[PDB]
Design an enzyme around this catalytic site. Structure first.
Site, mmCIF file in Angstrom:
data_model
loop_
_atom_site.group_PDB
_atom_site.id
_atom_site.type_symbol
_atom_site.label_atom_id
_atom_site.label_comp_id
_atom_site.label_asym_id
_atom_site.label_seq_id
_atom_site.Cartn_x
_atom_site.Cartn_y
_atom_site.Cartn_z
ATOM 1 N N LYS A 1 15.820 25.530 3.879
ATOM 2 C CA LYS A 1 15.277 26.667 4.614
ATOM 3 C C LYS A 1 15.222 26.383 6.112
ATOM 4 O O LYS A 1 15.315 25.233 6.539
ATOM 5 C CB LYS A 1 13.882 27.024 4.094
ATOM 6 C CG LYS A 1 12.900 25.864 4.106
ATOM 7 C CD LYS A 1 11.495 26.328 3.754
ATOM 8 C CE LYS A 1 10.525 25.159 3.699
ATOM 9 N NZ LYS A 1 10.844 24.225 2.584
ATOM 10 N N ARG B 1 -1.842 30.336 -1.169
ATOM 11 C CA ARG B 1 -0.892 31.215 -0.498
ATOM 12 C C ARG B 1 -0.520 32.415 -1.385
ATOM 13 O O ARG B 1 -1.004 33.535 -1.186
ATOM 14 C CB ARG B 1 0.370 30.427 -0.137
ATOM 15 C CG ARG B 1 1.422 31.212 0.628
ATOM 16 C CD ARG B 1 2.728 30.437 0.696
ATOM 17 N NE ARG B 1 2.539 29.072 1.180
ATOM 18 C CZ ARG B 1 3.521 28.187 1.324
ATOM 19 N NH1 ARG B 1 4.770 28.518 1.026
ATOM 20 N NH2 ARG B 1 3.257 26.966 1.764
ATOM 21 N N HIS C 1 2.945 24.772 -6.381
ATOM 22 C CA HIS C 1 3.222 23.958 -5.192
ATOM 23 C C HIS C 1 1.953 23.246 -4.757
ATOM 24 O O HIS C 1 0.905 23.875 -4.675
ATOM 25 C CB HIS C 1 3.722 24.861 -4.067
ATOM 26 C CG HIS C 1 4.226 24.123 -2.869
ATOM 27 N ND1 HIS C 1 5.268 23.225 -2.934
ATOM 28 C CD2 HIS C 1 3.872 24.195 -1.565
ATOM 29 C CE1 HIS C 1 5.542 22.779 -1.723
ATOM 30 N NE2 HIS C 1 4.711 23.353 -0.872
ATOM 31 N N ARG D 1 11.875 20.190 -5.978
ATOM 32 C CA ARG D 1 12.309 20.863 -4.760
ATOM 33 C C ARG D 1 12.195 19.834 -3.643
ATOM 34 O O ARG D 1 11.117 19.630 -3.077
ATOM 35 C CB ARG D 1 11.417 22.081 -4.457
ATOM 36 C CG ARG D 1 11.266 23.090 -5.615
ATOM 37 C CD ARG D 1 10.326 24.254 -5.260
ATOM 38 N NE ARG D 1 8.967 23.803 -4.978
ATOM 39 C CZ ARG D 1 8.029 23.615 -5.901
ATOM 40 N NH1 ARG D 1 8.297 23.848 -7.185
ATOM 41 N NH2 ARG D 1 6.823 23.180 -5.543
ATOM 42 N N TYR E 1 6.439 21.423 38.708
ATOM 43 C CA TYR E 1 5.525 22.535 38.954
ATOM 44 C C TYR E 1 4.089 22.045 39.067
ATOM 45 O O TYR E 1 3.687 21.117 38.366
ATOM 46 C CB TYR E 1 5.619 23.561 37.826
ATOM 47 C CG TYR E 1 6.855 24.411 37.865
ATOM 48 C CD1 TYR E 1 7.139 25.205 38.970
ATOM 49 C CD2 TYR E 1 7.729 24.453 36.783
ATOM 50 C CE1 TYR E 1 8.259 26.022 38.996
ATOM 51 C CE2 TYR E 1 8.856 25.268 36.800
ATOM 52 C CZ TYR E 1 9.112 26.048 37.911
ATOM 53 O OH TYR E 1 10.227 26.844 37.946
ATOM 54 N N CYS F 1 10.557 21.361 32.694
ATOM 55 C CA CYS F 1 10.963 22.724 33.032
ATOM 56 C C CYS F 1 11.537 23.466 31.822
ATOM 57 O O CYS F 1 11.621 22.937 30.717
ATOM 58 C CB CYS F 1 12.001 22.710 34.154
ATOM 59 S SG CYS F 1 11.415 21.936 35.662
ATOM 60 N N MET F 2 11.948 24.701 32.042
ATOM 61 C CA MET F 2 12.503 25.486 30.967
ATOM 62 C C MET F 2 13.823 24.895 30.516
ATOM 63 O O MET F 2 14.068 24.785 29.319
ATOM 64 C CB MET F 2 12.703 26.922 31.432
ATOM 65 C CG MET F 2 13.093 27.905 30.347
ATOM 66 S SD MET F 2 13.213 29.546 31.083
ATOM 67 C CE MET F 2 11.534 30.147 30.916
ATOM 68 N N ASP F 3 14.656 24.479 31.469
ATOM 69 C CA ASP F 3 15.979 23.942 31.146
ATOM 70 C C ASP F 3 16.262 22.487 31.507
ATOM 71 O O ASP F 3 17.409 22.038 31.383
ATOM 72 C CB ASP F 3 17.044 24.813 31.801
ATOM 73 C CG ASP F 3 16.724 26.278 31.696
ATOM 74 O OD1 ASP F 3 16.682 26.791 30.558
ATOM 75 O OD2 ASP F 3 16.496 26.914 32.750
HETATM 76 C C1 PLP Z 1 15.220 28.585 40.513
HETATM 77 C C2 PLP Z 1 14.595 29.602 39.658
HETATM 78 N N1 PLP Z 1 14.112 30.782 40.134
HETATM 79 C C3 PLP Z 1 13.579 31.654 39.231
HETATM 80 C C4 PLP Z 1 13.465 31.330 37.900
HETATM 81 C C5 PLP Z 1 11.999 31.364 37.745
HETATM 82 O O1 PLP Z 1 11.490 32.596 38.066
HETATM 83 P P1 PLP Z 1 10.030 32.809 37.587
HETATM 84 O O2 PLP Z 1 9.210 31.741 38.039
HETATM 85 O O3 PLP Z 1 9.585 34.116 38.028
HETATM 86 O O4 PLP Z 1 10.049 32.695 36.156
HETATM 87 C C6 PLP Z 1 14.045 30.151 37.395
HETATM 88 C C7 PLP Z 1 14.104 29.669 35.939
HETATM 89 O O5 PLP Z 1 15.034 29.675 35.094
HETATM 90 C C8 PLP Z 1 14.546 29.293 38.328
HETATM 91 O O6 PLP Z 1 14.478 28.008 38.002
HETATM 92 C C1 PLP Z 2 7.360 25.990 -1.950
HETATM 93 C C2 PLP Z 2 8.037 24.882 -1.248
HETATM 94 N N1 PLP Z 2 8.428 23.862 -2.023
HETATM 95 C C3 PLP Z 2 9.049 22.827 -1.435
HETATM 96 C C4 PLP Z 2 9.278 22.774 -0.067
HETATM 97 C C5 PLP Z 2 9.658 21.417 0.408
HETATM 98 O O1 PLP Z 2 8.580 20.571 0.571
HETATM 99 P P1 PLP Z 2 8.818 19.375 1.516
HETATM 100 O O2 PLP Z 2 9.547 19.835 2.679
HETATM 101 O O3 PLP Z 2 7.650 18.634 1.864
HETATM 102 O O4 PLP Z 2 9.527 18.403 0.773
HETATM 103 C C6 PLP Z 2 8.940 23.846 0.780
HETATM 104 C C7 PLP Z 2 9.980 24.200 1.851
HETATM 105 O O5 PLP Z 2 9.956 24.942 2.834
HETATM 106 C C8 PLP Z 2 8.275 24.889 0.120
HETATM 107 O O6 PLP Z 2 7.499 25.676 0.867
#
Ligand code: PLP
Ligand code: PLP
Lengths: 371, 370
Positions: free
Chosen positions: A40, A139, A169, A222, A267, A313-315
Site C-alpha cells: 500500500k 478502527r 489486526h 500480511r 530563513y 528550504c522547500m527545495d
Molecule cells: C527566491 C524565491 N522567491 C519566492 C519564492 C518564495 O515566495 P514566498 O516566500 O512568497 O513563498 C521562492 C520559493 O520557491 C523562492 O525561493
Molecule cells: C490491516 C493491515 N495489516 C497489515 C499491514 C502491515 O503491517 P505492517 O506494516 O506493520 O507489517 C497494514 C498495512 O498498511 C495494515 O493496515
C-alpha cells in the site's frame, strides 16, 4: 507534478533486498501458511509494482492494498494473484471489484445487504469478501462473536458472494508488554469459535506479529514494513532475523562556498557562523519530504558527517562541510558511506515519528531507481 | 496512483488564486511586474492550474525551482518567461536554450564553461539572471566586486542575454526588520557598481511585497500569498485580505459506538473514558495527514471532532458527538458551519509552517478545480 529527473537527488530501491527479506520470512513459517505482501501507499513509498514484483520472487502468493485504485494499479501491471483491499469500499464501486476480481474486506452486514443488490442473481463472478472482526484496534470490523456469525452465514446464504477469509489486526504487536495483544487474540479466538466453517484465509499477523508472536493461529500473514528491511518496532526489539534495508536516499553538493564568522544563514537567520565555515548547498527540501525539523540532523559526504545548518528550504538545505570540497561529491542522506550509516529509523527519531511515515513522505518529485 | 475512488479530496479554488494575484497587482506600482512562483507543483495545489490562474490574475512571468518543472510548464502551453530559481547543471544548457528558459547563475565558472557549449552559434541567447547573496547564505555572488565581472562577462558575449538580477530576503516577515535592512543595503551596493541594469531587477517575495513595498526593484516573485496563506504565519496581518485557495475533504466510511474503556489505534494510545461514537476517515499520514495530528479536530456537520488514537498510514479515527450514519462530509481544511480549519492551524499542530503542510499533501489525494 513532474519528477526531478534532471536533478541529482535520487531514491535508490534495492529490489533484491525486498526479495531476500521476504524469502527469509517464508522460510520460518509453516508450509500451510501463505505470505501476502502488503504494498500500500505505493509500497510504503518504494513503489508498489516493483515491491510487488520483488515480493513475488520471494515467495509471496498474494497482495494487500489499501485502496481500490491501488488494487487496480497492480492488475494493470499484470499482477494475477489475489489482491485484498484492506479497507471499506464504496458501494458505488462494487462492480469494479468484480471486474478486476479483487478481494474486499467487509465490516458490516449493512454493506453486504446492499452489496447483494446490484449483484447478479447468480453471478459466475462471486465477490471475494474477507470479514474483519475487531477485537482491539477500534478502527473497523464486527464486534461479534454473534455479529460475525451472522455476517458469515449471510455471506454463504448467497452464491453472489464467496468468503475468502476472516481476519483481525493487532494494535500492539510491536510492544514489549504483550498483555493487550493476548486480549485481541482472545477476542478473535472467542469468535472463530462460534463458527462451524472456516474460509481458506484466516489471517491476523503483520510484520511485528510474524516476528515476535509466531505461534499464533492463522494460515496467512500480511507482511508489511519488514519486507522493506525496516524493524517494525522502531528500536524496541530485535527482528528474528537480520532484515535488509531496501531504501537509500542520495543527492549532491551543487554549490560550495566559504562564509565569514558572524554570517546568518537560512530563513529567520536561525543559524550564524561561529567562524570560517564551508557551506554546501544540497538540492533536496521539505517539498521532497526532507522535513524542516531535520535541521540538526547530519548527512554524509566522503564518509564524514555534516550538520544541516539553518532552515531547511522547500527545495534545498545547507550543510556545514568539514574541509574544503568541490561541488559534485555525492551526499548520502539515507544509506551507508565509509564507516557511517544513516538509518530511516535515525531520520524517524529526529522527526519524532516512525520510519513508516518518513518513507511515505518522500515526494514523487524524487525519482526512484531500482536495481 | 491517484485515489479517485476514495471519498477523499483536495479542492483548489483557482478563482481565489486569481483574486489574490489581482489585488497584489493593483497595489503594485503597475510598472513593476508580478512573477508567480509555482514550484513544488504550485505549492501542493498544482503548478499548471496555478500558473494559468495567476496569469488571468495579472502574472506576466513564472518562477520554478527545477528544470523539470519549467519543462512541465512549457509542454503545457505557457509561453511566458519561466525563471529557474536554482542552478542548472551545465550538461542541460541545451535544454534551457531549447525551451528558452531563464536561468539563475551564482558563480563565475558556470558562465565561462556554459559559453563554450552555447555558441558556436548565433540564434537565441541564454537568458541569464544573476543572483547575489547578501544574507540568505545559500547561493550567489557575495560581493559587489563580483557580479561586476559577471555582468561584464555576460554583456561581452552574444551567447547570453542577462535578463535580470536579484537576491532573496530571509527575514522579510519578522516583526524585527533589522536583518532585512542589512540585506537590502548589500544589494544596494552592488547595483552601485553597475552602469546598467537588465530588464528585471527583482528582490522581493510575498512577505517583503506585503510589508516592504517600498524596496527597490521592478518585479516581485509572488509566492505563498497567491495561495491565500499569511507568509508570516500569524505574526503580522496581511497588507490586504488573502483568500485561501486550498480545501481538504473526506467523509465518514464507518461509524460505531464503543463501550467504556475500549482501546483505539496502534499502541493503544487512546482509551474510551465512556461509551462514545467513533468515526473512521479514509486518510492517514501516507497522504500527508501526519501522525502528530493526533489531538487535532476535524469538522463534520459544522462540529469539531477530535481525532483520537493513533493516525494510521491510510486512515484515522475521530470522536463524534451525536451518532450518525456513514456518508457525512468531513472538512479537514476549510469552513463548515460557523467553524473553520486553516493550514495555519494544521501548521500550528505539526509545529512547522503551512508551506510544508501544503507541499506534503500526497500525490495520492486527487486535486479538483473550478
Ligand atoms: C527566491 C524565491 N522567491 C519566492 C519564492 C518564495 O515566495 P514566498 O516566500 O512568497 O513563498 C521562492 C520559493 O520557491 C523562492 O525561493
Ligand atoms: C490491516 C493491515 N495489516 C497489515 C499491514 C502491515 O503491517 P505492517 O506494516 O506493520 O507489517 C497494514 C498495512 O498498511 C495494515 O493496515
Amino acid at each position: 507534478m513532474v519528477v526531478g529527473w534532471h536533478r541529482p537527488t535520487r531514491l535508490h530501491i534495492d529490489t533484491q533486498a525486498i526479495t531476500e527479506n521476504v524469502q527469509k520470512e517464508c522460510q520460518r513459517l509453516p508450509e500451510g501458511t501463505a505470505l501476502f505482501a502488503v504494498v500500500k501507499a505505493n509500497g510504503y513509498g518504494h513503489g508498489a509494482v516493483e515491491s510487488a514484483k520483488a515480493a513475488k520472487k520471494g515467495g509471496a502468493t498474494g497482495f494487500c492494498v489499501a485502496l481500490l485504485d491501488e488494487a487496480i494499479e497492480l492488475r494493470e501491471a499484470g499482477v494475477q494473484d489475489p489482491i485484498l483491499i484492506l479497507s471499506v469500499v464504496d458501494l458505488a464501486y462494487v462492480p469494479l471489484l468484480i471486474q478486476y476480481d479483487l478481494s474486499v474486506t467487509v465490516a458490516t452486514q449493512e454493506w453486504l445487504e446492499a452489496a447483494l443488490q446490484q449483484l447478479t442473481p447468480e453471478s459466475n463472478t462471486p465477490l471475494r469478501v474477507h470479514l474483519k472482526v475487531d477485537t482491539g484496534m477500534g478502527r473497523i470490523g464486527f464486534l461479534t462473536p454473534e455479529e460475525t456469525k451472522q455476517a458469515v452465514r449471510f455471506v454463504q446464504s448467497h452464491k453472489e458472494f464467496l468468503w475468502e477469509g476472516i481476519f483481525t489486526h493487532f494494535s500492539t504487536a510491536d510492544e514489549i508488554d504483550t498483555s493487550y495483544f493476548e486480549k485481541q487474540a482472545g477476542r478473535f479466538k472467542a469468535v472463530l469459535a462460534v463458527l462451524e466453517e472456516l474460509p481458506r484465509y484466516v489471517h491476523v499477523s503483520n510484520s511485528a506479529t510474524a516476528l515476535w508472536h509466531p505461534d499464533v493461529p492463522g494460515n496467512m500473514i500480511r507482511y508489511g514494513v519488514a519486507m522493506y528491511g525496516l524493524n517494525p518496532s522502531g528500536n524496541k526489539l530485535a527482528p528474528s532475523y537480520a532484515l535488509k534495508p531496501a531504501l537509500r536516499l542520495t543527492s549532491e553538493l551543487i554549490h560550495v562556498k566559504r562564509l565569514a564568522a558572524g554570517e546568518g544563514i537560512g530563513y529567520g537567520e536561525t543559524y550564524v557562523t561561529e567562524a570560517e565555515e564551508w557551506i554546501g548547498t544540497v538540492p533536496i527540501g521539505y517539498a521532497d519530504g526532507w522535513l524542516r525539523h531535520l535541521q540538526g540532523f547530519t548527512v554524509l559526504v566522503n564518509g564524514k558527517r555534516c550538520e544541516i545548518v539553518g532552515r531547511v528550504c522547500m527545495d534545498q538545505c545547507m550543510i556545514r562541510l568539514a574541509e574544503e570540497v568541490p561541488v559534485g561529491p555525492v551526499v548520502t542522506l539515507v544509506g551507508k558511506d565509509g564507516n557511517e550509516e544513516n538509518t530511516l529509523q535515525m531520520v524517524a527519531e529526529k522527526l519524532e515519528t516512525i520510519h513508516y511515515e518518513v518513507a511515505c513522505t518522500f515526494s514523487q518529485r524524487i525519482p526512484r531507481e531500482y536495481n
